[PDB]
Amino acid sequence: SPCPGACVCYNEPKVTTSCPQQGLQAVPTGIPASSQRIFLHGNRISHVPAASFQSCRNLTILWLHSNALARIDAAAFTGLTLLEQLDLSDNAQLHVVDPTTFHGLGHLHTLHLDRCGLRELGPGLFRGLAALQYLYLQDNNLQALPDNTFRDLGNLTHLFLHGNRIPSVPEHAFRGLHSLDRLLLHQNHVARVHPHAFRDLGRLMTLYLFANNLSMLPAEVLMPLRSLQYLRLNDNPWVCDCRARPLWAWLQKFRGSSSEVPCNLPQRLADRDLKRLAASDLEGCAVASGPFSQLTDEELLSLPKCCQAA
């Protein structure tokens, strides 16, 4: 089959059908089945039917970023067993992706879902993608991080989740990520992290948690991070008292580079780095919940265990 209109087809280095920066409001008909690389970025494609791309059995790279995508059929990528790169980024209209869209893509190693406005990550959305190494989910509308979302992503090295409305980190949210190298979770709403949440992140070297809503960090949370060399806890409402003691001992016994850990409370130790603080500064308590040692024994029950010291 000859090359379709408003397109350029060539064979070197791979059989490529290139139709970018056109006025195409949909996928052009007549794309050669021999295509290994398809470039349809910079257009105005609204929908991606299931019939399209099926002919291209040998398709390895597919670019559909910077379009007007709003609805992708669940069987659109059926038959593309050799698909390696899939870029669907910069599609703010694409608010939701059907959980069975990526089934069968066992060769996919890079996936772009950034700047799409994804509200949620559907159950089984990343099931069976055991070859995925780069997953871009940054700058979406994600406001939840469900357990076992990346359970099958054992080869994943880069996971970008920054720029979302993610409120907390459940225990099994990052389970299965044994080969994770960099984890970017900055500019979210993270205020709570489970003690055994980084259970499998032993090979993690980079962890970005800055610009969040964290007030404290448990004792067992940073324990499994044996390979961590870069850590950033900038821009967080840290509370510097007895509850910050397990974090302080960790920051002290840490060789890798880490950003500043600015205190927010109490005002006495405000703006100072928890790193440089001494063991004496980490006693008593600071104001939490209702603003105010005139608290009753019942009232201090709503305070940390160390904070309840007599």
Ligand X SMILES: *[C@@H]1O[C@H](CO)[C@@H](O[C@@H]2O[C@H](CO)[C@@H](O[C@@H]3O[C@H](CO[C@H]4O[C@H](CO[C@H]5O[C@H](CO)[C@@H](O)[C@H](O)[C@@H]5O)[C@@H](O)[C@H](O[C@H]5O[C@H](CO)[C@@H](O)[C@H](O)[C@@H]5O)[C@@H]4O)[C@@H](O)[C@H](O)[C@@H]3O)[C@H](O)[C@H]2NC(C)=O)[C@H](O)[C@H]1NC(C)=O
Ligand Y SMILES: *[C@@H]1O[C@H](CO)[C@@H](O[C@@H]2O[C@H](CO)[C@@H](O[C@@H]3O[C@H](CO)[C@@H](O)[C@H](O[C@H]4O[C@H](CO)[C@@H](O)[C@H](O)[C@@H]4O)[C@@H]3O)[C@H](O)[C@H]2NC(C)=O)[C@H](O)[C@H]1NC(C)=O
Ligand Z SMILES: *[C@@H]1O[C@H](CO)[C@@H](O[C@@H]2O[C@H](CO)[C@@H](O)[C@H](O)[C@H]2NC(C)=O)[C@H](O)[C@H]1NC(C)=O
Name the residues that contact Cl ion, by CB under 5 A: 110, 134, 304-305
Q: Is there a cis peptide before residue 13, judged by omega within 30 degrees of 0? A: yes
* Breaks in the chain (C–N > 2.5 Å) following residue: 292
Q: Does 34 engage in binding with ligand Y (CB under 6 A)? A: yes
> Whose Cβ is closer to ligand Z: residue 101's or residue 236's?
236
E strand or H helix at 80: none
Q: Does 213 engage in binding with ligand Z (CB under 6 A)? A: yes
Q: Does 304 engage in binding with ligand Z (CB under 6 A)? A: no
Find the DSSP H helices in the chain. 245-252
Minimum distance, C-beta of residue 40 to ligand X, in the bound complex (Å): 26
191-210 binders of ligand Z (CB under 6 A) = 191
41-70 binders of ligand Y (CB under 6 A) = 57-58
The residue with tokens 């104001």 is 287
Total interface residues for ligand Z by CB under 6 A: 3
54 touches, from ligand X, Cl ion, ligand Z, none (C-beta below 5 to 8 Å by class): none
Q: Does 307 engage in binding with ligand Z (CB under 6 A)? A: no
- Residue spans of beta strands (DSSP E) within the chain: 8-10, 16-18, 37-39, 47-48, 61-63, 71-72, 85-87, 110-112, 134-136, 158-160, 168-169, 182-184, 192-193, 206-208, 230-232, 238-239, 257-258, 263-265
| Token duo for residue 257 | 């580079």
Which residues form the interface with ligand Z (CB under 6 A)? 189, 191, 213
Which residues form the interface with ligand X (CB under 6 A)? 130-131, 154-155, 178-179
Which residues form the interface with ligand Y (CB under 6 A)? 33-34, 57-58
